[PDB]
Amino acid sequence: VRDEVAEKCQKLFLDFLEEFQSSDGEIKYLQLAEELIRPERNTLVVSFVDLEQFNQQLSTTIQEEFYRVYPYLCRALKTFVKDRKEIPLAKDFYVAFQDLPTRHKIRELTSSRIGLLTRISGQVVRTHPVHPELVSGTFLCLDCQTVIRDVEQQFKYTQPNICRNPVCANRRRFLLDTNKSRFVDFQKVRIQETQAELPRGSIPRSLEVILRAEAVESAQAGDKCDFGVDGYETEGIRGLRALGVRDLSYRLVFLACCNQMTVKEWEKVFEMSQDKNLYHNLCTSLFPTIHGNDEVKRGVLLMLFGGVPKTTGEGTSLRGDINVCIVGDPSTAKSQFLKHVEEFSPRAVYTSGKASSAAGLTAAVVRDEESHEFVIEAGALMLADNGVCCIDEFDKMDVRDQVAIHEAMEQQTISITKAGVKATLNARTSILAAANPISGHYDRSKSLKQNINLSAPIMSRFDLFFILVDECNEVTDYAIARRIVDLHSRIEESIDRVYSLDDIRRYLLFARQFKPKISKESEDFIVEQYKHLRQRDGSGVTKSSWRI
């Protein structure tokens, strides 16, 4: 089988393989070709679209024949230069498909689906350094013979064990013609099953799949996947054991490479877009079981909502995200709620605040030096990229986050540094914040400074602050937990919404695709009032905190 399948494909390939659409044949292939030789990238793509028209069997049997169709179609491929003498100087290639109709979960990437065709969706996690182990080559026994061009290749250590005199490795062999080797390129990384898709009781899945050369340095831990024999010596002969064979059997085996309802929901969103009171129509649907603090929710509502400036001063592209705090009593004083409230949303990451060993966001490679505790993941912060981070207990950030957020806020990145290793990352997401003060509400007369009980250069950085002061207001408080019991009143009650806690998530889906920009006028009232804001604040008015 191995030979015909190795060959019969090429014919079905090659005729397919001269770029077809927009007239046909040689012209479109040459664009792909001339695009290839000139930067010396050696990479292409083969859309699954045209193939299943041409031959879906190819489009299928790939999955059914991937693992020996490769090294021949691989080899026939390489005369794109239009010259066979310039192909063996080439080192390797990497290609891709287009528009496989499927992907699968990791739990759906099963034993009965190992190795197969991979549409590649998930979570970059726990990266590594990157190495070109050897595909093919020799170390052939110097005492008796020279090159045989096959050893290492699979994840393995040495290869060749068929038919000595020295050719099989029932004989010494180690020196490698290092000038002659397919050291290729890759790292191993522990791609997680995205919890943001997952049904609560889940426990995610850190798939140790590789980013080889073309897949390389394009991602960061938390992020997208967009990728003749011998002798008749048969089984059962004395001396053979499977423990030399199993460690891959212990592994991954695959790898990767680089509407009425719409309108109806839109209509209700349009109606909602027509809807006045929309904050209140929004608010309690998101903030059902808080009394007072209507301001505080009001921002946090908005804190959900983004909007970015690009770079046009050649600086950074400016902030759109928000960093605001709620300050006061002990979680019961529900800042917990808000952290919990937000969870009724995805793109949403949730700490145990800070008092949490959970050493992630002190990133480090997990096989530094024999196997390593600190993991390449600031999912403490990173993992909410273009989401939001929600942190209680922020005062317990003692060190490792302490400076960390400062730049990270400021720069949306994590400059990793090890002095044998070093990196920087990207975290474009918001920071929802709340932390208790020194021991309680004392800020009525004490300065925020040290009443916040945190460091100026971040409290300064926080986009806003807010408060949840506790008070025994019997004028209200008779009614207050009157709610809460009525919130404890499960047996016969359901919490009234303005509307779904989904459509909102689709509103804010609908909301941020729209964009905004101010008129030639609107700046004035910014200015005249920012003035006036500073003006009263600059004139000696009764101050709460010198910020301005």
Binding site: L89, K91, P129, H131, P132, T178, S181, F183, K422, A423
Partner: protein, 204 residues
Amino acid sequence: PRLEIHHRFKNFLRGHNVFKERISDMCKENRESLVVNYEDLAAREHVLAYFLPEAPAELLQIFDEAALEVVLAMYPKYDRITNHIHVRISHLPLVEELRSLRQLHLNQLIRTSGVVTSCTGVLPTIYQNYQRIRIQESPGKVAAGRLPRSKDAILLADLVDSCKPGDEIELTGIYHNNYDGSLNTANGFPVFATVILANHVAKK
């Protein structure tokens, strides 16, 4: 990978007015090295500089094989001063900088440049036959200010100690893929791993 040029090159070491003028240039000095430019070889014979991607490693052995001969031949005074030559060849055009790097471009004698990120100037016989220096390139710009994969090069016993920390200089060498750390026996560049052997240096 044939075998005539060894003997020829040993005779090509005997465009040659420069050699006749360079052999006199180095000298009573006793510096244990020999320097040729990519123009100097081709000025004599263009077959020679063509080896530099294909058999530079052997060409170094050739050049070492021949440089021992004609020089001790020309000057047996060297018979009592180290009786050995370890060549120091000159520029070799082209230059692959720090992110121009390619698996394609390896196992090749090239010129490039790079700047000390670290050095082992006073410490290292394999290790003692050389030392290490860790390297990157770039200046500040927003795009170039992005962290590059640092070069980590080795200085084979003759270019040693001429590089100093902070040296934005021109590193010529052979650019091998012998990253035998693949199973725990070497170091090399990051992602496009290249074990670079070293051949020339610029100044502080």
